[PDB]
């Protein structure tokens, strides 16, 4: 297991735009687009992500090709942020992989919100952080991932993906 199987899993693979949870225009591996109500909007944004007149249809490989950007793009964020960079590298390469997903699922904003969470972690208070995390519109909104993701901070382990 690693981090882009782990989100392969948590996100899918759709190669038409769709909307996400939140109603969003969104395709390939949970590549947001746009969260403007337009339709054209967010085709517009697609051909200019793609380079090319897709019509709102991608291939496979266009969707890893996004895909592999957009985690790349979340660890930098990390990376690039003052609160988030230490916890990130207090951790094991697991632990790393549930907050990239956090960031790649809510972004560098969403997530550098969660500073008590943030604070524990950087601790190793695993049970702890588990129960703040838990405290979350991101837990009530989408359970099942965000159990994934906490038991994954929680053991250190991919258990919650086999
Ligand atoms: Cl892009
Ligand atoms: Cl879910």
Not at 85 to 113: C, H, L, W
Request: net charge positive; hydrophobic share 40%; no cysteine.
């Amino acid at each position: 297991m690693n981090i882009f199987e782990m989100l392969r899993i948590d996100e899918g693979l759709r190669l038409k735009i769709y909307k996400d949870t939140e109603g969003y225009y969104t395709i390939g591996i949970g590549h947001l687009l746009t969260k403007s109500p337009s339709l054209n909007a967010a085709k517009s944004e697609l051909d200019k992500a793609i380079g090319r007149n897709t019509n709102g249809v991608i291939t496979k490989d266009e969707a890893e090709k996004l895909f592999n950007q957009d985690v790349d793009a979340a660890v930098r964020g990390i990376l690039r942020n003052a609160k988030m960079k230490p916890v990130y590298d207090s951790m094991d390469a697991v632990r790393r992989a549930a907050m990239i997903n956090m960031v790649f699922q809510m972004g560098e904003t969403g997530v550098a919100g969660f500073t008590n969470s943030l604070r524990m972690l950087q601790q190793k208070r695993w049970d702890e952080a588990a129960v703040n995390l838990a405290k979350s519109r991101w837990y009530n909104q989408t359970p099942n991932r965000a159990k994934r993701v906490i038991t994954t901070f929680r053991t250190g382990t991919w258990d919650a993906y086999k």
